[PDB]
């Protein structure tokens, strides 16, 4: 974190569906 737009497993929410 910050999330929102990171880079390995995971994506913030979706990527706009959740945060973004």
């Known amino acids: 974190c910050x999330f929102x737009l990171p ?3 995971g994506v913030c929410x979706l990527x ?3 945060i973004x």
Do not use: F, K, L, V
């Open 7 to 9: 880079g390995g497993g």
């Open 16 to 18: 706009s569906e959740c």
